[PDB]
Symmetry: D2
Subunit: 292 residues, 4 copies
Amino acid sequence: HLQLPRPVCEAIIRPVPEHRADQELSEIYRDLKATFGVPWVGVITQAVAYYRPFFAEAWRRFAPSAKTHFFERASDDIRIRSWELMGQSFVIEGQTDRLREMGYSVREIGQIRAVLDIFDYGNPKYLIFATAIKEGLLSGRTFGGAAGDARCHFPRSPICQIDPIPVMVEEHHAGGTLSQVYADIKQTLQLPFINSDYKAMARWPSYLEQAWGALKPCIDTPAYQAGRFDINARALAALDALPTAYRMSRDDALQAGLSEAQTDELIQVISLFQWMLSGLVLNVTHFKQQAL
Amino acid sequence: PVCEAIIRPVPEHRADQELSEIYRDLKATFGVPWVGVITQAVAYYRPFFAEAWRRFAPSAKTHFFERASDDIRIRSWELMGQSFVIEGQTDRLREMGYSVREIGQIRAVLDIFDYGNPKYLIFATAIKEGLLSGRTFGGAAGDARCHFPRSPICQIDPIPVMVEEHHAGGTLSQVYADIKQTLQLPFINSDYKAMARWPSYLEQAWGALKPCIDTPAYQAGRFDINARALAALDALPTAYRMSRDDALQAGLSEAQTDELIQVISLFQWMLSGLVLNVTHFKQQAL
Amino acid sequence: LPRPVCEAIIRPVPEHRADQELSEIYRDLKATFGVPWVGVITQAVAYYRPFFAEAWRRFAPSAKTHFFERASDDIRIRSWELMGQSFVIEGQTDRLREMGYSVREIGQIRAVLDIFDYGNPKYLIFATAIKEGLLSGRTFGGAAGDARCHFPRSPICQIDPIPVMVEEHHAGGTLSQVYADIKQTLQLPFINSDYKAMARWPSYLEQAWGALKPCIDTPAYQAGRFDINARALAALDALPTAYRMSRDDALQAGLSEAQTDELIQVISLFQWMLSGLVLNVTHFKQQAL
Amino acid sequence: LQLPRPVCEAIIRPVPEHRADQELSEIYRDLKATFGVPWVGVITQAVAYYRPFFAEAWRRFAPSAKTHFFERASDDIRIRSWELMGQSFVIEGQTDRLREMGYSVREIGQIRAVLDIFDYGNPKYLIFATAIKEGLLSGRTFGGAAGDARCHFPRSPICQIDPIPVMVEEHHAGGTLSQVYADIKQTLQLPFINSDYKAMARWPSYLEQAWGALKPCIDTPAYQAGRFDINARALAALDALPTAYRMSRDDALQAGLSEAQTDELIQVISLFQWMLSGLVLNVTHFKQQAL
């Protein structure tokens, strides 16, 4: 009552960060960001990018859907649901005064909020794409492409920007005690990597400490796990309603250039990220509500 | 629409630092990179404009307002889809020397005004109808999610490159003169000035839209879009009142209020056509 | 300083068309010069991509130096001097505000002029290096001299964004007539970045050009132009890192001999203009405050 | 074997760009446009606390800072520092070290680009701090002394102005960063953390590496000899300003400052003026490691 199970993953995650991405991969990354209308490339997508012929082909097959009005709406309703869920389930104290007291100015606190907005907007879109990748491999099915409201096929609300990449304190940038927030987060969220979200927050170390410290107790409360299940279900639902059909099976993966062992590995990797992203959506919603 | 009043818009490149602060809050809230000529003109009646924005902002910050603006964009895209067959111009433009990247730069520009103009239409409606009627618009608790914060990403920098009328040269003044004639306006909108950064492109897009202007299908769409704007006003999440009397406590004279009313009425009428005109452009480009 | 004969077609590759291979060179040229546009000079030479890449590889080490910064800066200074004395130049800040321009608009205009005032001497010296290298076969520079000449140049610079330029296919009816006038008056087959960047404000360009035009090819002008050219040739004789790039070097780079002969004609056209363009911009900028 | 001595102290109250109201932001913006730099110095933040002095000293110094002379005189302080540190120190590259720590080539370039900013701008702040301090201490009028007309020409005009460098402020800092900051403060003998080190702190592991390599050189005789030389260049520049500068105690009083305020400012500008010679040397060192 009522919990989302963490998939087994013993495969090594090998994300290709934007600052290491070669010219070819950089072009794909850029088209993703333009399509999603986000200034960063998700770690989810960095890790998938390792298996590059798969990534390119699964991107090419999913992009016609991510361009649509439906995707914008369906992602946005996931942001709404998280706001709704966390509000009702939690007493979230504002932290603005506490930050002001630690010496943060008004300009700075708005800067912090702007960074929270980036991830509040983008993560839903990454959740659905990860659901498409993971379920397309596991099931071999084709998803969406149904007739429906023509308006679902219209251009999504045009926004921006690709630029710049948010300032993120990477793990090799860290940091000493910052590595230990990083380790705590890792232990607590049960992950082997630190999310883009927390690395952006890490440009203000004392702020991350504060925000993460107030979120931690909520993690894996019954209301948290229940809400996480709901977030995930809504991503499954979005998958079945894509305006342009999506299929990317094991055989598609093999035809794209992957070995059997590679495809097995990918399946674990995408599975952990897809699981992860339900929580990440909730976590950012909390951060944003603290900062009102 | 009846108007004899002089329109006295304050450009962002002239705005003083007190007004520039309002402008900036308008831009962050709407999530757009330009201050519309609508609001430029209303800023002249500065006391009213700061009070009106005070009262409208809490609605504009909401989920409701975001969807309601987006649904106007959707509707316009629908209407111009049906009522007009509109040929791509992507090939003509490459024939003229424009490269792929340049054509994407043009699109990115249209996207701005395609996203924003609905937000300025709803605000213009709220100003006009509030003055004319003294009614309090909106305020219902209804669905809670309507009061949630809007989709947060946007971009407010840079100000788009606009070729102002005093920048303009010989023939560009003629394209401007035609546009002011055809559209019955005494000013050139941001949109066309922004397009005029590529003058040959503007000539080509204007000439393709110009025949559509006062056709019965256009007038009908323009009525439809206007209706939706009126409907959005009726459903603002935070109440909005700003009457003739309210304008006084803001610091306007009755005579200035009467001038104000004529000014907004012209702009509010204008924004309907602007939303359509832009849709058309965007459809021309792929 | 007579215009050279150029019957060859100029085929510049603009930044919005450059493939990712060329674009990477372009970005290195920009970071090195510390400027935010790639010169048409560079665009035209890049058509001969094999040569262009080798020539930049060889010219880059001098361009990174304190010497090169100083020697480019000293040309800007000299041009400022010459136009100060040889011409009576009229403040026009007042007509502009009269024409409708706000003070921040006039400021944006100055910032644009500043870019070309800074950068063009660097392009002049480069074009001179390419030209004399092909014509003479000689190795230029390489002396140890004063060690401080080989130190890194003054680091600060802006390379984003690309200036807004109204290209010849962007242009409307009248704007093609201004461009026509300029290409005629200056004896050029193309429109320089500079004027295209001023063209962002069409009425302003009409004015600034109208004021410069009666100075072109006056004896004082031609004399200054001779001086600016002479200073570029001297900058070449004093490069910190040796620069050789001969006709023979162009073959070994991957050009044919016919392509080389065409290149010589092209670069000679540009190298002759760049002295002219340096004074033109000085004039524009003295028109502002 | 020669040293520049540091003077004594009062309390420093810098007004950072993110707190600055909009009157002050307007002066800050003209400063940066005139210097051609993306950051307002802590030197000038601290002086901005005494706002009508700051406003007036800036108004008097700016005509000189616009000139070709200033640009050159600043640039030569940078060159001399590069010369100085080169000749006097066995300074090893740290690029292979960083890459081993996991830093990529794009990242190391980003770090250089940040080092470039302060290597350019600090000499200009040094000269201005020397003008503020000596003008108060002496009552004298500096420069204006009609020489080469080319000295009065506009300076080299391109400049990087509008992204303020990402700086990890003290109240941003978390734990071990505060102790690095403490080490720096204690070693450089300062009660504040320079913009430079805070910009470097966007990459904590890099700051620790770069700072740790520098720390041995600080107050070697070669360091101090060099620091004295940097300081002399700054005094020399002051006497050759093309537009005369005077800003005395009574200039300060007539601007709205009290006697006690003026005494305080004097101690504050003296500490910053002293600091800047060392900072010039410290950045030169960082930048040579990163070759």
